[PDB]
Amino acid sequence: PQFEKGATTRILGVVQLDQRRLTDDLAVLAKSNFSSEYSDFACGRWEFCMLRNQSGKQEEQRVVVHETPALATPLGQSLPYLNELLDNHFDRDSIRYARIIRISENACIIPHRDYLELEGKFIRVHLVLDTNEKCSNTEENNIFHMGRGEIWFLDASLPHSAGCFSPTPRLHLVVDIEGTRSLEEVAINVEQPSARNATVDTRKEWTDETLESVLGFSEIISEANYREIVAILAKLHFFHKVHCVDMYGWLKEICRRRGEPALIEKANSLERFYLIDRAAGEVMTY
Ligand SMILES: O=C(O)CCC(=O)C(=O)O
Ligand SMILES: O=C(O)[C@@H]1CCCCN1
Numbered sequence: 001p002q003f004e005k006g007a008t009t010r011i012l013g014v015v016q017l018d019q020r021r022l023t024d025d026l027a028v029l030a031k032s033n034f035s036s037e038y039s040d041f042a043c044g045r046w047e048f049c050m051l052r053n054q055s056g057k058q059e060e061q062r063v064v065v066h067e068t069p070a071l072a073t074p075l076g077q078s079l080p081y082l083n084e085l086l087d088n089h090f091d092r093d094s095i096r097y098a099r100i101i102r103i104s105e106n107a108c109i110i111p112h113r114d115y116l117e118l119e120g121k122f123i124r125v126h127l128v129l130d131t132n133e134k135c136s137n138t139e140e141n142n143i144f145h146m147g148r149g150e151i152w153f154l155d156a157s158l159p160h161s162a163g164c165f166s167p168t169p170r171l172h173l174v175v176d177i178e179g180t181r182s183l184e185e186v187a188i189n190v191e192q193p194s195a196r197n198a199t200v201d202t203r204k205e206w207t208d209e210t211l212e213s214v215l216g217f218s219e220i221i222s223e224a225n226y227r228e229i230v231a232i233l234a235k236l237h238f239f240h241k242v243h244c245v246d247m248y249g250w251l252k253e254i255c256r257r258r259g260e261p262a263l264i265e266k267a268n269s270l271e272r273f274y275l276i277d278r279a280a281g282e283v284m285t286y
């Protein structure tokens with residue numbers, strides 16, 4: 001499948017981070033209750049917690065297009081530096097959600113598009129809090145590293161993923177801005193980024209040998225191992241030069257070769273759910 005372009009994913013600004021104050025709030029987050037919502041998108045320990053949402057209540061853990069300035073949750077009110085960053089670098093009344101998104105060692109989010117279930121869209125922006133060179137984000141055919149203190153706009157309507165392959169977890173502050181806002185006006189009190197060369201793409205060329213190894217999962221794929229296989233497929237594009245949606249084609253061919261109708265139907269359902277269309281509240285299972 002092919003996907004219409006949108007606003008360009010890029011660095012909106014760079015900010016200084018107070019390491020002492022940040023360290024304190026990150027230490028709280030290391031012991032905090034992360035949501036299990038959207039675990040249907042997680043390949044391992046990809047997870048988030050709400051700092052601001054519609055109601056200001058901990059129970060509210062899913063997103064919907066809405067019209068009100070986001071209210072801090074008890075967790076958000078307990079993280080004074082992160083609360084200050086939200087106050088300082090964004091317009092309060094434009095925020096619809098604010099979250100911390102943590103990826104732990106060898107985890108990723110499955111390649112997907114956001115907003116399919118929404119009546120509208122958000123402008124999604126990431127402020128990188130704690131990362132390392134073994135953490136990357138992807139978009140289509142591209143891989144890139146979002147660095148500490150950078151505020152990025154991500155076009156979440158293009159297929160994309162994110163992973164962490166370090167022992168140390170990766171934390172981003174992720175803000176959903178009301179979708180009609182002027183993107184260029186979203187980040188406040190920032191330094192404009194100095195021009196950069198592209199992130200260096202160190203991934204391996206994709207070969208016939210690698211593809212045949214993968215398609216060979218047809219001999220063992222089953223309901224019992226379907227999730228592990230999907231996760232393996234999802235992680236390949238962090239290390240091999242392929243498009244992040246290619247895994248859905250691989251899965252379809254694996255299942256075609258196996259010849260079991262249930263697995264073929266499931267593979268079609270996965271592509272549909274992650275990339276094409278979803279209803280509000282719809283969850284995918286294995
Ligand atoms: O970097 C991440 O953890 C998530 C990227 C993503 O899929 C999103 O923000 O929609
Ligand atoms: O838009 C959201 O909040 C979620 C994030 C995780 C992937 C699915 N969509």
Ligand SMILES: [Co+2]
Pocket residue numbers: 112113114156160
């Ligand atoms: Co996303």
